[PDB]
Amino acid sequence: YLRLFGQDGLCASCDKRIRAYEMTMRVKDKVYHLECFKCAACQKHFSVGDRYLLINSDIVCEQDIYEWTKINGGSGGSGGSGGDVMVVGEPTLMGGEFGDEDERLITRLENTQFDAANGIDDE
Ligand SMILES: [Zn+2]
Ligand SMILES: [Zn+2]
Questions:
Q1: What gap in Å lies between CA 20 and CA 6, rounded to an integer?
Q2: Which domains does the chain carry?
Q3: How would you class 69 by CB atoms within 10 Å of its CB: exposed for 0-12, middle for 13-18, buried for 19 or more?
Q4: Closest ligand to residue 22's CA
């Protein structure tokens, strides 16, 4: 096996290399671009905090979910449990180094001060 530069999670929708920009969440088996993260029936874009359903090809929003599955699906309960929905995860930049090379060569003590407010949102 020969090594490759970049990412191994290509966009199964547009068949393009997911690198540098990407800014997407990790899906079940296949990874897709943010711009490519649109509905298969409405072609609309999804936002963080909303629940999405992954169809045979692309993502299908709750707006056309019933009518879409009704035409290309039907009836049939065969398999091993199926009825879960996932929320669109926030984008995480691949450009982030988290290492401690300075504390491994030289040992130094430092004092840090942080202020916390504490409080949750309801409305
Ligand atoms: Zn793509
Ligand atoms: Zn839709």
A1: 8
A2: 1-123 (2.10.110.10)
A3: middle
A4: 1
- Say if CB 71 and CB 56 are below 8 A apart: no
Maximum pairwise Cα distance, the chain: 66
Token pair belonging to 27: 């899906």
Tokens of 18: 């997911």
Experimental technique used to determine this entry: NMR
Give residues with Cβ within 8 angstroms of 7, minimum separation 6. 17, 18, 19, 22, 94
Ligand 1 midpoint to CA 8 (Å): 13
How many CB atoms within 10 Å of residue 39? 21
In a 13 Å sphere around the CA of 101, the CA atoms on its Cβ side amount to: 3
Q: What's the gap in Å between 67 CA and the centre of ligand 2?
A: 10
